[PDB]
């Protein structure tokens, strides 16, 4: 049978606000394509302005996971701000723990996102541009204290490898993207350039030696890539005014996948143009990346999308059309919507635009 | 949650203890061969069954209007047909168990009466 | 009840020519009741060669 149950709820906020409550559930009675099982994960994200006078927001993400009885944790805090329309700066720290091992890290990085063109013929003729090719120039400075003998071993092996081989710049991509991440890079249109290691030096920090490594890379996009084509959309710093939280996490085993993601954040609804609001165009990279992994089983889908508009807010051009309505609580279920849900769960890219305005 | 089903039952059992309590105050003479303990309870059960049946009909016909789809090609007419069958067979096994005869057992089918 | 069927209908016609000629009348119509994998919908196209 392999029936895939899923309920999605989108509760928007009105006026100039673009916020939205997003809670989704998934219950798929199919084996996940994880070479290690069971893979139980807990993901918690938070962000709040630090000083909106210049754009700092303190975004904190905690990943807790237990994959084949291996407790994995990754906490990270960052102070990200848009220094320029095309440039972004960030600074923060974190820690990575796997079983008994745990190494803390602090970093400072700047990501500069360029678009290959800025023609206004496209802008004034394509009302909803989707594919926007470009290249992000990450410039990452990260310092990791070297306390454990394993930290010493990693640092010494890395510096010896960099000194030894001249192909470390391109062969790191094999290590950097473990397993099918490399194939995901190509299917999503991403391309990782050879990293430019600007120096790996260690200095005795507060309590011991700290591995400070300057490096940068330039990862491009054919248009599908979310981090480039929607650079100004994925980081709504201007329209953030209160703590925003997203709590994801899946409990997964050899015979099922259970997903429950909560949400509170701006950018759910973006102005489609001329006062017409819309649900933001679906981020394509998650769809295509779930693409290599959602096609392994044929599934029956009973997907329920419950979009709750604010008061006075009507809808226009729902495609697929909303199935039932309760004057705000628009509901998508069965018919063409379940077909679209199957399409996008198997990796589809088909558009489902919700153009709403009061 | 579960407090509703502890109140839908809780409200109903309140009616059971309230209709039964007022029968002993609204002084009435019951049926010739009946007991005053059960004669208000039967009326309460009928009343509650009426309300509950109306509510479940409303809920069911509202639910099988959001859940109904093109996938109900079969078992929508088959469920209707089996409902028709069970009604027709209850017309013979439960309601009016036999076709009417006289007390002796004779059948009268023409205008011989 | 059954699984997600999503029927697709299509016909194809090929009419060839004899001798050394390699020509052929190809005629094809299709109808898939599935959402196209395009981020902008609806799409139309009219290709003339």
């Amino acid at each position: 049978v392999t029936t895939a149950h899923s309920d999605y709820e989108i509760v928007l906020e009105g006026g100039s606000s673009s916020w939205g409550k997003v809670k989704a559930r998934a219950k798929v009675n199919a084996p996940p394509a994880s070479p290690l099982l069971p893979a139980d994960c807990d993901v918690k994200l938070n962000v709040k302005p630090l000083d909106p006078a210049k754009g700092f927001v303190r975004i904190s993400a905690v990943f807790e996971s237990i994959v084949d009885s291996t407790k994995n944790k990754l906490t990270i805090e960052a102070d990200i701000a848009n220094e320029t329309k095309e440039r972004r700066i960030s600074v923060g720290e974190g820690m990575v723990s796997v079983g008994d091992f745990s190494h803390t890290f602090s970093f400072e990085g700047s990501v500069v996102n360029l678009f290959y063109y800025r023609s206004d013929a496209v802008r004034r003729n394509v009302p909803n541009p989707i594919y926007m090719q470009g290249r992000q120039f990450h410039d990452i400075l990260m310092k990791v204290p070297l306390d454990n003998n394993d930290l010493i071993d990693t640092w010494e092996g890395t510096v010896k490898a960099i000194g030894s081989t001249g192909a470390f710049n391109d062969w790191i991509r094999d290590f950097w993207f473990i397993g099918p991440a490399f194939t995901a890079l190509n299917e999503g249109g991403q391309r990782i350039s050879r990293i430019e290691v600007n120096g790996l030096n260690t200095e005795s920090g507060p309590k011991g030696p700290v591995g400070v490594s300057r490096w940068r890379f330039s990862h491009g996009g054919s248009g599908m890539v979310d981090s480039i084509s929607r650079w100004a959309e994925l980081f709504p710093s201007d329209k953030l005014n209160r703590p925003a939280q997203v709590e994801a996490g899946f409990r997964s085993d050899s015979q099922g996948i259970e997903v429950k993601v909560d949400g509170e954040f701006p950018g759910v609804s973006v102005d489609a143009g001329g006062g017409l609001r819309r649900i933001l165009n679906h981020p394509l990279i998650p769809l295509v990346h779930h693409g290599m992994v959602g096609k392994f089983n044929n599934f029956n889908v009973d997907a329920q999308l419950k979009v709750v508009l604010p008061k006075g807010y009507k809808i226009r051009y729902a495609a697929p059309q909303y199935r039932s309505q309760n004057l705000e609580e628009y509901r998508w279920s069965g018919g063409a919507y379940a077909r679209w849900v199957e399409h996008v769960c198997k990796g589809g890219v088909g558009q489902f635009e919700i153009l709403y305005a009061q | 949650n579960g407090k509703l089903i502890a109140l839908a039952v809780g409200g109903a059992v309140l009616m059971g203890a309230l209709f039964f309590s007022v029968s002993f105050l609204t002084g009435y003479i019951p049926a010739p061969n009946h007991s005053a303990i059960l004669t208000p309870l039967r009326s309460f059960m009928g009343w509650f069954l009426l309300i509950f049946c109306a509510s479940i009909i409303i809920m069911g016909l509202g639910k099988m209007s959001s859940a109904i789809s093109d996938k109900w090609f079969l078992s929508f007419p088959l469920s209707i047909f089996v409902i028709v069958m069970v009604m027709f067979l209850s017309l013979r096994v439960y309601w009016e168990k036999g076709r009417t005869t006289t007390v002796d057992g004779k059948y009268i089918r023409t205008t011989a009466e | 009840g059954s699984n997600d069927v999503t029927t697709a209908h299509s016909d194809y016609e090929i009419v060839l020519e004899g001798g050394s000629s390699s020509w052929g009348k190809v005629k094809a119509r299709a109808k898939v009741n599935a959402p196209p994998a395009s981020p902008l919908l609806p799409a139309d196209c009219d290709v003339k060669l």
Binding site: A318, Q321, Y322, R323, A336 | S66 | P42, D44
Partner: peptide
């Protein structure tokens, strides 16, 4: 203009 006809359609997914 074929989109406009689909754009300007009443919800036809009623039960």
């Amino acid at each position: 203009r074929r989109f406009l006809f689909q754009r300007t359609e009443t919800r036809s997914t009623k039960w």
